[PDB]
Amino acid sequence: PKNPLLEKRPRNFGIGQDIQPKRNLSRMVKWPEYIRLQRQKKILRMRLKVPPAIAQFQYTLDKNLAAQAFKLLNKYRPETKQEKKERLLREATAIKEGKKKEDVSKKPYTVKYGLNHVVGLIENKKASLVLIANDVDPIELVVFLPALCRKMGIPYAIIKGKARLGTLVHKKTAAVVAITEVRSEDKNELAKLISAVKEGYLEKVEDTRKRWGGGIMGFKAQKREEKRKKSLETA
Amino acid sequence: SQPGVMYIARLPHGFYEHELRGYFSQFGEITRLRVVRNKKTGASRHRAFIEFADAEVADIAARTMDKYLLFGHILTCKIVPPAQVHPDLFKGA
Amino acid sequence: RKAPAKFRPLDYAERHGYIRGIVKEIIHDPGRGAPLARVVFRSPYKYKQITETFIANEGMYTGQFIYAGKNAALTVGNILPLSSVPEGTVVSNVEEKPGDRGALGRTSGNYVTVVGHNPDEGKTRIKLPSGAKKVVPSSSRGMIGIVAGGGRTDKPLLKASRAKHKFAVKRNRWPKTRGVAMNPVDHPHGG
Amino acid sequence: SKAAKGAQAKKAAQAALKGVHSHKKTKVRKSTTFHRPKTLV
Amino acid sequence: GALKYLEELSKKKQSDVVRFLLRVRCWEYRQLNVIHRASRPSRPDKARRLGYKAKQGYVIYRVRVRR
RNA sequence: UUUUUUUACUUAUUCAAUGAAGCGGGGCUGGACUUGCGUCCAACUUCUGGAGUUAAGGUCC
């Protein structure tokens, strides 16, 4: 049995009654200027009309195709410092016993990276697959890359994460990665990935890459125009 | 209202009746389903027909799953029109 | 002078209901012909009370409850938006825009007359003490009544000392030298 | 209902193309004042 | 490399893409402080031909002046 | 495709307020008109110079 001395003291939160309870006021928080600036920058890029060469970067690989591309490319990460030190020790041993370094070292296969290097490979038509980060700032560094790849007939895809590409190439960020050639046991996987990129990314973005982006209205303005159109239709 | 029929091909080995029913029931409930199979062996011919109860549910599933890279196969997911749905397509489903 | 004579800032309570304050003091403000009223309101968001300084309308008294908001009664001393008052109501400290805490009809014996309402676009036509007509948003607030202390200028000052006492607390230029009493270097009227 | 069927199909499509991490926690802030966080000195 | 393309694009200041970028960056720099540090050059080809390097000891500061 | 006119919009720019506290859109309840269920409009404190703040409580653990 409950104690008879326990009492309920409900509070009325109407106007002029008891003090208002502490609510979530995060929508009305006075933010620091850097937070307010980055949010407003994103909003302004949504509100203005975006030319197609920039707006094409909103169309990226889906989760499955990005995971398959990373599954292939994670077998071709560049040499670490320890691995290079061990290789150089073995080559120094071969030179000491009077052998060429190519006798103890095989031809490497790596993911190609560095923007100038990859642009050179595309222009020489050596790249077989090009992956471009969607968030390179300044955007001008990669804004010509889909046009260049289309002119050279190279399969490309826009993928989310310069940091994600940096994890491939042992860096913090990477603007672009390319595959030129792989090993014989992964040639079939690369060809299947290239066909998947062509049929599931490039054909699907063939029309949407030519459109203008942005021009989205804010919430209150959208509701205002909906109410205005409803009133015009009613009257 | 009207059912929707999806043709799915490039099926990897293992994407069979129970797997297809369970996977596409996430999109919407399935009226009928048949994997095309060889009578001499029982082996799959890497294609199947799924009749969803609802048409744009079938359309959403097909546009989602078309060109999906699954175990080395780029799937073929298409909506077949009701005019070319065969009357005996789901015999044995 | 301690505090400026302003309304409360326009908040949720005044926008949607009413809030009650109590008139604690009616005080003299140097340089101003009209008395001021100190009114204490509750803070809806905290335990501490808030003291406000209004221009006192005639008939306000210490110990009186006044009401500020949309649903406040049409009674002297109450603060209402102009959309909540009928035509012909006289008010004081009328806001030019809602939330400017009062701009029009502030000196002693003066008031603003609500002439008309246009509810379609939410406007209110008012008449100012100078006789000018104005259109203000209907959500602009005003205090019902006439500013206290009227008839102040009916009495002659009668003495240079009384004029001096009036203007010394006001900072206005006194005494005033005529331009024609000056040399030509000082005034265009000089000479 | 037809709207519910469409909503279910849309949710399955969103899961297939983007994954299942669709939601994110945000702090409840009972004040409108932002204070600089206290860090190691 | 990409810097030849960047130079040829920076010549086209009245094109749609460059005018969009200039407009949004002008808004952002107007919201920032009058003098503030840039984390990286916003025109890497121009900075490199003027002598900037991605080496410790090179900094970029952005400044607006009344014209 | 361009030149004028007005006629809307908001994203630049400008003004003001606040401790950036309740804006916009729905849901619930009540009232009206309507059509035979869509709008708009309202929720909350008015006899008194008192007091109102450390959540009471419900329900799963």
XYZ file of C-alpha atoms (C1' of nucleotides) in Angstrom:
688
model
C 0.000 0.000 0.000
C 1.195 3.500 -0.874
C 1.818 6.060 1.848
C -1.240 8.299 2.438
C 1.084 11.270 3.047
C 2.286 11.211 -0.568
C 0.681 13.955 -2.640
C 0.543 14.966 -6.296
C 1.401 18.607 -7.050
C 0.782 19.064 -10.793
C 2.116 22.161 -12.518
C 0.171 24.185 -15.058
C 2.402 25.574 -17.796
C -0.122 27.895 -19.411
C 0.435 31.616 -19.793
C 0.721 33.449 -16.473
C 0.762 30.198 -14.466
C 3.741 28.234 -13.068
C 7.280 28.701 -14.388
C 7.933 27.089 -17.792
C 9.914 23.835 -17.652
C 13.356 23.487 -19.173
C 12.758 22.460 -22.789
C 15.024 21.536 -25.680
C 15.942 24.905 -27.207
C 18.585 23.643 -29.640
C 16.714 25.109 -32.622
C 17.131 28.574 -31.076
C 20.714 28.285 -29.794
C 23.060 31.201 -30.442
C 25.856 29.289 -32.135
C 29.490 30.322 -32.514
C 30.272 32.101 -35.748
C 32.188 29.198 -37.305
C 29.281 26.774 -36.790
C 26.795 29.348 -38.077
C 29.054 29.990 -41.079
C 29.478 26.359 -42.128
C 25.733 25.713 -41.795
C 24.913 28.848 -43.788
C 27.469 27.902 -46.451
C 25.756 24.542 -46.963
C 22.338 26.239 -47.052
C 23.436 28.895 -49.576
C 24.851 26.228 -51.879
C 21.448 24.539 -51.716
C 19.490 27.769 -52.347
C 21.433 29.039 -55.356
C 21.370 27.424 -58.806
C 24.407 25.176 -59.256
C 25.966 24.809 -62.740
C 26.086 21.191 -63.975
C 29.886 20.824 -63.818
C 29.659 21.255 -60.040
C 26.215 19.692 -59.603
C 27.374 16.385 -61.130
C 29.385 15.677 -57.959
C 26.169 15.084 -55.990
C 25.690 11.779 -57.841
C 27.967 9.172 -56.275
C 28.394 5.418 -56.029
C 25.885 3.501 -53.960
C 26.916 1.562 -50.861
C 27.298 -1.837 -52.539
C 29.309 -0.629 -55.539
C 31.577 1.494 -53.343
C 32.170 -1.533 -51.099
C 33.051 -3.754 -54.075
C 35.425 -1.123 -55.481
C 37.107 -0.818 -52.085
C 37.264 -4.615 -51.808
C 39.297 -4.726 -55.005
C 41.414 -1.666 -54.239
C 42.326 -2.750 -50.692
C 44.495 -5.499 -52.215
C 46.611 -2.876 -54.008
C 47.552 -0.465 -51.238
C 51.006 1.123 -51.674
C 54.098 0.027 -49.810
C 54.418 0.928 -46.155
C 57.657 2.305 -44.717
C 58.564 -0.989 -43.029
C 57.868 -2.960 -46.211
C 60.009 -0.569 -48.250
C 62.823 -0.808 -45.691
C 62.743 -4.614 -45.867
C 62.720 -4.523 -49.678
C 65.680 -2.126 -49.741
C 67.584 -4.364 -47.314
C 66.994 -7.361 -49.593
C 68.088 -5.366 -52.650
C 71.221 -4.179 -50.832
C 71.982 -7.818 -50.023
C 71.556 -8.754 -53.701
C 73.837 -5.887 -54.789
C 76.419 -7.035 -52.224
C 76.348 -10.592 -53.595
C 76.534 -9.186 -57.110
C 72.952 -9.465 -58.337
C 70.592 -6.907 -59.832
C 67.750 -5.608 -57.676
C 65.245 -6.916 -60.238
C 66.468 -10.440 -59.464
C 65.063 -10.192 -55.922
C 62.243 -7.681 -56.525
C 59.159 -8.222 -58.676
C 57.091 -5.705 -60.603
C 54.736 -3.856 -58.229
C 51.013 -3.292 -58.652
C 49.568 -0.413 -56.653
C 46.675 1.988 -56.610
C 47.865 5.101 -58.433
C 47.311 8.399 -56.656
C 48.287 12.037 -56.660
C 46.214 14.361 -58.828
C 48.965 15.393 -61.273
C 50.080 11.771 -61.670
C 46.533 10.531 -62.288
C 45.784 13.320 -64.794
C 48.951 12.297 -66.629
C 47.868 8.648 -66.660
C 44.429 9.624 -67.996
C 45.979 11.754 -70.752
C 48.313 8.898 -71.698
C 45.289 6.525 -71.584
C 46.994 4.221 -69.086
C 44.305 4.447 -66.396
C 41.684 1.710 -66.470
C 39.485 3.017 -63.652
C 39.316 6.446 -62.003
C 37.670 7.215 -58.654
C 37.161 10.874 -57.730
C 36.274 12.193 -54.284
C 33.025 14.152 -54.093
C 34.244 16.795 -51.614
C 37.471 18.294 -52.971
C 37.887 21.921 -51.860
C 38.735 23.912 -54.059
C 36.405 22.092 -56.461
C 38.324 23.347 -59.527
C 41.033 20.726 -58.909
C 38.699 17.925 -60.071
C 35.832 19.742 -61.814
C 37.299 18.972 -65.264
C 38.039 15.321 -64.425
C 34.742 13.718 -65.633
C 35.028 15.613 -68.932
C 38.656 14.532 -69.328
C 37.776 10.900 -68.564
C 34.849 11.015 -71.001
C 37.089 12.403 -73.745
C 39.723 9.728 -73.165
C 37.132 6.948 -72.824
C 38.128 6.081 -69.246
C 35.602 4.625 -66.777
C 35.273 6.953 -63.815
C 33.085 7.129 -60.753
C 32.519 9.810 -58.161
C 32.854 8.289 -54.700
C 32.245 9.737 -51.251
C 35.326 10.451 -49.179
C 38.687 11.991 -49.813
C 39.485 10.597 -46.350
C 38.207 7.209 -47.512
C 40.552 7.334 -50.527
C 43.359 8.443 -48.226
C 42.891 5.229 -46.258
C 43.652 3.416 -49.507
C 46.837 5.340 -50.152
C 48.093 5.740 -46.513
C 47.306 9.466 -46.451
C 44.810 11.637 -44.601
C 43.044 12.608 -47.831
C 43.216 11.731 -51.520
C 41.490 13.699 -54.261
C 41.603 10.947 -56.883
C 42.796 7.371 -57.285
C 43.326 5.309 -60.393
C 43.924 1.710 -61.345
C 46.066 1.066 -64.404
C 46.856 -2.649 -64.097
C 46.375 -5.430 -61.555
C 47.634 -8.969 -61.118
C 46.408 -11.923 -63.159
C 44.320 -13.321 -60.314
C 42.463 -9.988 -59.994
C 42.067 -9.147 -63.699
C 38.610 -10.772 -63.813
C 37.514 -8.899 -60.684
C 38.696 -5.594 -62.162
C 36.867 -6.222 -65.440
C 33.667 -7.111 -63.595
C 34.033 -3.950 -61.492
C 34.565 -1.827 -64.620
C 31.448 -3.284 -66.256
C 29.509 -2.710 -63.027
C 30.677 0.911 -62.895
C 29.698 1.507 -66.532
C 26.252 -0.084 -66.261
C 25.309 1.035 -62.753
C 26.810 4.482 -62.369
C 27.603 6.055 -65.740
C 24.413 5.056 -67.554
C 22.333 6.118 -64.549
C 23.999 9.548 -64.351
C 24.195 10.074 -68.139
C 21.202 12.429 -68.112
C 21.333 13.778 -64.549
C 24.920 15.021 -64.909
C 23.780 17.651 -67.436
C 21.192 19.256 -65.154
C 21.465 22.324 -62.974
C 21.605 21.711 -59.240
C 20.377 23.645 -56.254
C 17.425 25.995 -56.399
C 15.794 24.292 -53.417
C 13.518 26.467 -51.306
C 13.622 26.798 -47.543
C 10.970 25.223 -45.348
C 8.973 28.339 -44.461
C 9.117 29.666 -48.028
C 7.953 26.281 -49.343
C 4.989 26.331 -46.961
C 4.240 29.937 -47.968
C 4.100 29.056 -51.665
C 1.990 25.964 -50.950
C -0.487 28.129 -49.031
C -0.434 30.776 -51.781
C -1.107 28.208 -54.516
C -3.878 26.615 -52.448
C -5.502 30.022 -51.903
C -5.215 30.843 -55.614
C -6.773 27.496 -56.565
C -9.577 27.942 -54.023
C -10.322 31.505 -55.157
C -4.587 -3.540 -57.283
C -2.867 -5.089 -60.288
C 0.080 -7.411 -59.584
C 3.549 -6.632 -60.838
C 5.861 -9.168 -62.496
C 9.643 -8.778 -62.324
C 12.116 -10.810 -64.366
C 15.440 -11.257 -62.572
C 18.479 -12.813 -64.236
C 22.220 -13.182 -63.661
C 21.363 -14.997 -60.435
C 24.424 -16.150 -58.479
C 24.434 -19.674 -57.132
C 22.614 -19.450 -53.805
C 20.100 -16.733 -54.738
C 17.252 -19.240 -54.947
C 13.557 -19.422 -53.990
C 13.797 -18.887 -50.229
C 16.502 -16.211 -50.521
C 14.543 -14.310 -53.180
C 11.271 -14.549 -51.248
C 12.910 -13.366 -48.040
C 14.867 -10.567 -49.681
C 12.081 -9.094 -51.795
C 9.444 -9.507 -49.083
C 11.349 -6.660 -47.435
C 10.215 -4.475 -50.329
C 6.712 -5.907 -50.403
C 4.721 -9.076 -50.070
C 5.131 -11.591 -52.885
C 2.186 -13.349 -54.506
C 4.066 -15.856 -56.676
C 7.667 -16.815 -57.420
C 9.412 -19.301 -59.689
C 13.090 -19.955 -60.424
C 13.598 -21.411 -63.897
C 15.174 -24.835 -63.488
C 16.393 -27.741 -65.599
C 14.213 -30.838 -65.320
C 17.065 -33.285 -65.974
C 19.227 -31.962 -63.132
C 17.225 -29.635 -60.906
C 19.864 -26.963 -61.478
C 18.988 -23.287 -61.672
C 19.139 -21.443 -64.981
C 20.086 -18.155 -63.243
C 16.709 -16.516 -63.872
C 13.442 -16.200 -61.988
C 10.071 -14.488 -62.109
C 8.570 -12.740 -59.084
C 4.949 -11.596 -59.011
C 4.483 -8.920 -56.348
C 1.001 -8.115 -55.116
C 1.436 -4.440 -55.955
C 2.764 -2.873 -59.147
C 4.830 0.167 -58.142
C 6.215 -1.880 -55.262
C 7.508 -4.213 -57.977
C 8.760 -1.174 -59.916
C 10.629 0.205 -56.881
C 12.231 -3.188 -56.231
C 13.324 -3.533 -59.866
C 14.803 -0.032 -60.054
C 16.572 -0.618 -56.743
C 18.062 -3.998 -57.577
C 18.859 -3.565 -61.275
C 22.616 -3.643 -62.101
C 23.436 -4.677 -58.517
C 26.833 -6.390 -58.240
C 26.240 -9.594 -56.255
C 28.931 -12.311 -55.932
C 30.443 -11.370 -59.279
C 27.123 -11.042 -61.127
C 25.633 -7.758 -62.335
C 21.955 -8.532 -61.755
C 19.251 -7.970 -64.365
C 16.042 -6.763 -62.692
C 13.291 -5.703 -65.090
C 9.545 -5.161 -64.937
C 7.697 -7.175 -67.550
C 4.511 -5.503 -68.829
C 1.140 -7.167 -68.148
C 0.575 -7.505 -71.896
C 3.631 -9.762 -72.191
C 3.111 -11.617 -68.912
C 2.557 -15.171 -70.126
C -0.670 -16.779 -68.819
C 1.306 -19.884 -67.782
C 4.392 -18.103 -66.408
C 3.903 -19.161 -62.778
C 2.955 -22.776 -63.423
C 4.861 -24.720 -60.792
C 5.411 -21.656 -58.597
C 16.902 59.352 -14.801
C 17.305 55.649 -14.009
C 15.720 53.599 -16.813
C 14.205 54.340 -20.228
C 10.423 54.310 -20.553
C 9.674 51.252 -22.689
C 7.191 48.408 -22.845
C 8.203 44.868 -22.094
C 9.859 43.106 -25.039
C 7.252 41.319 -27.127
C 7.235 37.725 -25.921
C 5.051 34.609 -26.053
C 2.775 35.702 -23.206
C 1.944 39.067 -24.763
C 1.628 37.522 -28.218
C -0.833 34.781 -27.239
C -2.440 35.637 -23.885
C -1.839 38.230 -21.183
C 0.533 38.756 -18.266
C -0.271 40.626 -15.049
C 1.979 43.233 -13.488
C 1.614 45.307 -10.339
C 2.229 49.063 -10.201
C 4.587 49.638 -7.269
C 5.725 53.265 -7.640
C 4.651 56.350 -9.561
C 7.730 58.539 -9.814
C 8.900 61.845 -11.215
C 11.336 61.696 -14.136
C 13.619 64.754 -14.468
C 13.437 66.397 -17.874
C 10.103 64.704 -18.612
C 6.735 66.320 -17.999
C 4.969 62.963 -17.618
C 5.288 60.732 -14.537
C 6.582 57.185 -14.860
C 5.177 53.977 -13.399
C 7.299 51.108 -12.109
C 5.468 47.836 -12.776
C 6.684 44.428 -11.590
C 5.909 41.376 -13.731
C 6.727 37.717 -13.292
C 9.294 36.109 -15.481
C 7.620 33.095 -17.130
C 10.991 31.319 -17.434
C 12.589 31.857 -14.015
C 11.849 32.569 -10.366
C 13.149 36.154 -10.285
C 10.736 39.015 -11.012
C 11.237 41.705 -13.668
C 10.749 45.433 -13.067
C 9.622 47.585 -15.995
C 9.265 51.347 -16.435
C 6.181 52.618 -18.274
C 4.869 56.077 -18.997
C 1.990 56.419 -16.543
C -1.453 57.066 -17.966
C -3.880 59.208 -15.999
C -5.751 57.260 -13.341
C -3.024 54.697 -12.692
C -2.264 54.174 -9.011
C 0.084 52.217 -6.772
C -1.194 48.739 -5.964
C -3.054 48.451 -9.276
C -2.868 45.325 -11.414
C -2.353 46.056 -15.100
C -2.470 43.508 -17.890
C -0.317 43.308 -21.005
C -1.067 41.047 -23.927
C -3.439 40.104 -26.705
C -6.236 39.006 -24.350
C -5.875 41.850 -21.839
C -9.030 43.785 -21.009
C -9.846 47.213 -22.454
C -9.060 49.133 -19.265
C -6.846 52.163 -18.512
C -3.254 51.075 -17.992
C -3.584 47.813 -19.909
C -1.264 47.170 -22.851
C -2.912 45.623 -25.910
C -2.102 45.225 -29.591
C -4.109 47.593 -31.759
C -5.902 44.653 -33.389
C -7.576 43.931 -30.027
C -9.076 47.412 -29.549
C -12.178 48.947 -31.170
C -12.186 52.091 -33.266
C -12.165 55.348 -31.326
C -9.991 53.976 -28.518
C -7.257 56.372 -27.441
C -3.890 54.886 -26.496
C -0.381 55.975 -25.557
C 3.211 54.839 -26.216
C 2.127 53.308 -29.515
C 4.707 51.168 -31.284
C 5.544 52.111 -34.861
C 6.495 48.480 -35.515
C 5.651 45.568 -33.198
C 8.450 45.209 -30.681
C 9.955 48.711 -30.757
C 8.575 49.146 -27.196
C 6.638 52.335 -27.941
C 7.242 55.529 -29.910
C 4.084 57.630 -30.366
C 2.012 59.721 -27.988
C 4.443 59.789 -25.077
C 4.393 63.341 -23.704
C 1.991 64.593 -21.041
C -1.660 64.952 -21.987
C -1.127 63.356 -25.407
C -2.572 60.223 -26.973
C -3.038 58.393 -30.269
C -6.536 57.730 -31.612
C -7.284 54.431 -33.349
C -9.227 55.533 -36.430
C -9.671 52.312 -38.368
C -8.805 48.678 -38.959
C -7.970 46.888 -42.217
C -7.996 43.240 -41.075
C -7.296 41.794 -44.538
C -3.676 42.976 -44.671
C -3.495 43.459 -40.891
C -3.099 47.241 -40.780
C -4.417 49.912 -38.431
C -5.003 53.569 -39.242
C -4.205 55.932 -36.369
C -4.278 59.673 -35.721
C -1.257 61.264 -34.031
C -1.259 64.291 -31.676
C -0.005 66.506 -34.523
C -3.106 65.560 -36.530
C -1.159 63.376 -38.948
C -2.631 60.075 -40.098
C -0.525 56.940 -40.074
C -0.762 53.241 -40.898
C 0.916 50.830 -38.480
C 0.892 47.029 -38.222
C -2.052 45.830 -36.161
C 0.174 43.896 -33.738
C 1.754 47.138 -32.469
C 0.970 47.588 -28.792
C -0.413 50.600 -26.967
C -1.450 51.429 -23.422
C -5.123 52.323 -22.985
C -5.705 55.902 -21.900
C -4.065 59.336 -21.927
C -0.572 60.203 -20.685
C -0.718 61.753 -17.222
C 0.291 65.313 -16.420
C -1.810 67.143 -18.988
C -2.224 70.889 -18.831
C 1.426 71.437 -17.868
C 2.023 74.139 -20.486
C -1.094 76.107 -19.505
C 0.736 77.681 -16.556
C 3.092 80.552 -17.477
C 6.712 80.101 -16.449
C 6.669 83.771 -15.341
C 10.375 83.843 -14.420
C 13.738 83.427 -16.083
C 14.749 81.210 -13.154
C 11.856 78.827 -13.783
C 12.814 78.606 -17.456
C 16.431 78.015 -16.358
C 15.379 75.219 -13.998
C 13.274 73.659 -16.756
C 16.087 73.616 -19.301
C 19.063 72.834 -17.030
C 17.864 69.267 -16.456
C 16.890 69.012 -20.128
C 20.258 70.108 -21.716
C 18.406 72.384 -24.199
C 20.146 75.629 -25.096
C 19.247 78.365 -22.596
C 19.536 81.367 -22.618
C 19.056 81.967 -26.349
C 20.918 84.783 -28.094
C 19.253 86.195 -31.201
C 21.098 85.990 -34.505
C 20.424 89.652 -35.293
C 22.051 90.645 -31.986
C 25.302 89.055 -33.199
C 28.232 90.157 -35.324
C 28.297 89.052 -39.002
C 31.090 86.552 -38.263
C 28.816 84.643 -35.871
C 25.438 84.393 -37.610
C 24.087 84.958 -41.133
C 21.520 87.206 -39.428
C 24.433 88.950 -37.663
C 24.509 92.727 -37.931
C -2.841 0.862 -47.180
C -1.243 1.855 -50.482
C 0.689 4.684 -48.816
C 2.013 2.234 -46.215
C 3.067 -0.228 -48.937
C 4.871 2.549 -50.794
C 6.529 3.702 -47.574
C 7.758 0.168 -46.850
C 9.132 -0.202 -50.384
C 10.862 3.186 -50.123
C 12.404 2.218 -46.778
C 13.721 -1.070 -48.192
C 15.155 0.764 -51.219
C 16.830 3.319 -48.948
C 18.351 0.492 -46.902
C 19.585 -1.291 -50.040
C 21.198 1.763 -51.620
C 22.483 3.572 -48.516
C 22.557 1.217 -45.518
C 20.816 1.248 -42.160
C 22.590 4.094 -40.318
C 19.894 6.636 -41.114
C 19.723 8.440 -37.772
C 21.978 10.579 -35.612
C 21.938 11.712 -31.989
C 21.957 15.423 -31.187
C 22.462 17.029 -27.791
C 19.496 18.423 -25.898
C 20.366 22.013 -24.981
C 18.218 23.602 -22.286
C 19.906 26.994 -22.703
C 20.409 29.193 -25.751
C 23.899 30.067 -24.468
C 26.904 28.270 -25.924
C 29.883 28.039 -23.585
C 33.432 27.325 -24.660
C 34.250 23.731 -23.629
C 36.763 23.176 -20.858
C 39.927 21.545 -22.145
C 43.164 20.265 -20.668
C 45.538 22.975 -19.439
C 49.027 17.723 -64.163
C 45.817 19.441 -63.144
C 47.398 22.885 -62.730
C 47.406 23.595 -66.471
C 43.641 22.966 -66.469
C 43.313 25.190 -63.396
C 45.149 28.036 -65.150
C 42.987 27.734 -68.264
C 39.838 27.665 -66.123
C 40.944 30.675 -64.057
C 41.203 32.640 -67.290
C 37.416 32.169 -67.781
C 36.131 34.385 -64.996
C 32.787 35.134 -66.684
C 31.811 31.492 -67.214
C 28.909 30.056 -65.215
C 30.972 27.721 -63.011
C 33.604 30.336 -62.141
C 31.005 33.045 -61.481
C 29.138 30.674 -59.158
C 32.323 29.855 -57.245
C 33.315 33.528 -57.064
C 29.873 34.517 -55.760
C 29.708 31.904 -52.995
C 33.321 32.494 -51.944
C 32.742 36.256 -51.893
C 29.824 35.732 -49.518
C 31.912 33.452 -47.278
C 34.930 35.774 -47.160
C 32.609 38.679 -46.390
C 31.242 36.730 -43.418
C 34.778 35.959 -42.182
C 37.175 38.401 -40.513
C 38.770 41.230 -42.509
C 42.169 39.561 -42.103
C 42.156 35.847 -41.377
C 44.353 32.851 -42.041
C 43.516 30.518 -44.924
C 44.134 26.832 -44.257
C 45.223 26.349 -47.881
C 45.354 28.462 -51.045
C 41.977 28.774 -52.723
C 43.879 29.225 -56.023
C 46.612 26.547 -55.845
C 47.931 27.077 -59.394
C 48.289 30.834 -58.851
C 49.921 30.364 -55.445
C 52.361 27.795 -56.836
C 53.399 29.996 -59.754
C 53.872 32.897 -57.325
C 56.131 30.697 -55.205
C 54.020 28.947 -52.576
C 55.061 25.454 -51.546
C 53.302 22.810 -49.456
C 56.129 23.009 -46.939
C 56.267 23.929 -43.252
C 56.981 27.645 -43.141
C 54.601 28.758 -45.914
C 51.333 30.344 -44.802
C 48.406 31.984 -46.582
C 46.469 34.929 -45.188
C 43.268 36.240 -46.756
C 42.493 39.947 -46.491
C 39.778 42.248 -47.808
C 40.431 45.946 -48.472
C 37.937 48.715 -49.183
C 38.124 49.709 -52.820
C 17.228 34.813 -77.971
C 16.928 39.935 -76.759
C 14.651 45.267 -75.324
C 10.944 47.845 -72.149
C 6.704 47.515 -68.405
C 4.691 45.505 -63.768
C 4.492 41.473 -60.471
C 5.646 38.179 -57.576
C 9.906 35.588 -54.897
C 14.487 35.344 -51.652
C 19.633 33.967 -51.611
C 23.062 39.004 -51.724
C 22.682 43.664 -49.282
C 19.992 46.821 -45.407
C 17.084 47.815 -40.522
C 15.430 46.226 -35.723
C 14.820 42.840 -31.209
C 16.068 39.081 -27.762
C 19.186 35.978 -21.884
C 18.917 34.443 -29.937
C 12.221 31.028 -25.574
C 8.278 28.975 -27.744
C 8.691 30.691 -35.388
C 6.680 27.461 -39.406
C 3.873 22.900 -40.460
C 0.962 18.944 -38.434
C -1.532 15.985 -34.419
C -5.191 16.290 -29.952
C -9.661 19.068 -27.866
C -13.656 22.595 -28.319
C -16.564 26.200 -31.332
C -18.614 27.758 -35.670
C -19.913 27.922 -40.691
C -19.682 24.909 -44.799
C -20.146 21.046 -47.815
C -22.380 16.775 -46.054
C -16.231 17.399 -43.947
C -12.863 21.407 -46.016
C -11.616 25.862 -43.844
C -10.624 29.645 -39.670
C -10.189 30.305 -34.621
C -9.576 29.261 -29.796
C -6.938 26.725 -26.171
C -3.471 28.832 -20.796
C -3.810 33.121 -15.608
C -8.720 39.351 -14.128
C -12.631 41.166 -6.802
C -7.889 41.714 -3.373
C -0.302 45.850 -2.860
C 0.092 37.538 -0.359
C 3.012 33.480 -2.061
C 4.978 30.958 -6.609
C 12.103 28.631 -7.199
C 15.604 22.574 -5.171
C 9.449 18.294 -9.962
C 5.529 16.236 -7.155
C 3.624 12.058 -9.185
C 2.509 7.773 -12.864
C 4.753 3.527 -15.052
C 8.710 -0.129 -16.489
C 13.232 -1.865 -14.505
